[PDB]
From a paper:
Sequencing and annotation of the P. falciparum genome has supported the identification of new blood-stage vaccine candidate antigens, among which the P. falciparum Cysteine-Rich Protective Antigen (PfCyRPA) has a number of noteworthy properties. PfCyRPA is part of a multi-protein complex including also the PfRH5-interacting protein PfRipr and the reticulocyte binding-like homologous protein PfRH5, which binds to the erythrocyte receptor basigin. Moreover, PfCyRPA-specific monoclonal antibodies (mAb) inhibit parasite growth both in vitro and in vivo by blocking merozoite invasion. Here, we describe the crystal structure of the promising vaccine candidate PfCyRPA alone and in complex with the antigen-binding fragment (Fab) of the parasite growth inhibitory mAb c12.
In order to crystallize PfCyRPA, we needed to pre-treat the protein with Actinase E. The crystal structure of PfCyRPA, determined to a resolution of 2.5 Å (detailed in Supplementary file 1), confirmed our biophysical analyses. PfCyRPA adopts a six-bladed β-propeller structure that buries the disulfide bonds and the Trp residues. Each blade of the propeller is constructed by a four-stranded anti-parallel β-sheet. The five disulfide bonds in PfCyRPA are located within blades 2–6, stabilizing each individual blade. The first blade has no disulfide bond; it is formed by β-strands from the N- and C-terminal regions of PfCyRPA, potentially enabling conformational changes in PfCyRPA by opening and closing. A domain alignment search (DALI; [Holm and Rosenström, 2010]) for related structures revealed that PfCyRPA adopts a heavily modified sialidase/neuraminidase fold. The closest structural relative is the catalytic domain of Vibrio cholerae sialidase. Two molecules of PfCyRPA are present in the asymmetric unit and have conformational differences in several surface loops, suggesting possible flexibility of these loops in solution. PfCyRPA contains none of the residues necessary for catalysis, nor does it harbor a Ca2+ binding site, providing structural correlates of the absence of sialidase activity in PfCyRPA.
Numbering used by the authors:
A (entry chain E): 193 to 362
B (entry chain A): 32 to 67, 73 to 123, 128 to 188
Write the structure that this text describes.
Amino acid sequence: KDDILCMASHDKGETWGTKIVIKYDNYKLGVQYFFLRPYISKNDLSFHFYVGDNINNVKNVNFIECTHEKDLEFVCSNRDFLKDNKVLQDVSTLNDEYIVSYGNDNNFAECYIFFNNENSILIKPEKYGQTTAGCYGGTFVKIDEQRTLFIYSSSQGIYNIHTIYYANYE
Amino acid sequence: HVFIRTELSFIKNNVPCIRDMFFIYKRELYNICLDDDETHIYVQKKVKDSWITLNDLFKETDLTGRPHIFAYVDVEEIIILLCEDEEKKDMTCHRFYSNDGKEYQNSEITISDYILKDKLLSSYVSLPLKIENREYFLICGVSPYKFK
């Protein structure tokens, strides 16, 4: 009855006999997940995926966090990143805190980056020319606990690379 | 208390990739590009300003269509997996290994009656997940509800 399922390997991919169980006790039945992928950091397991069961048929990011039960069975739970006037995009972590990507609307004229939901930076991609350049597909590529890239392809051929340093103290 | 810094660099790619896939390895930046008639699966590296095709993993395969790709980056080791898109009952894949990011070593494997028989998958990069003194790589899948 588990909608999400992982087979897993501790022999570096030689064999995939291990089974990791994901109890995502969600409210809704028959809901299709798209582009599912696990976000992993140190101990923690999480998932990033899309759902399209909304009015506009537009796909919408969901991000669920998991903790532990058995050695192979995790219990996950949706994480609220909802934010008025912005659309949830990509998710990463710098230093056990979430860094989160958002578009202004579903057309990614702009992208905002939030640090621990407490500070934010604006990314206004320059136009390729006569046509609008968005940040559709902007994702994070983490370097270490203070540095991550945010890359997106304004248009085909062109890769916009944002190098990001962040540190929160006290 | 707070320190925030932003820089912008540009990169051009020879290849118009259908799907990009980014990983950091030894603080170099690497891509797994996919063009598509004719198809390839190029392993690329940013030396500043441009990507550089380092390998074509599609070549060393008896692979008919477009595979799922599951990349994993341990610190010393890079392991990539090209898995054929279903639609039998078991799934075959080809894996590539390097400890160096330049020379990937061929191979082929099969998971019989594999656990994700009727699950949908999509390509992604990942890290090993420590689970009580063990590292695991995960291939994860979702139930198919939308009518087809």
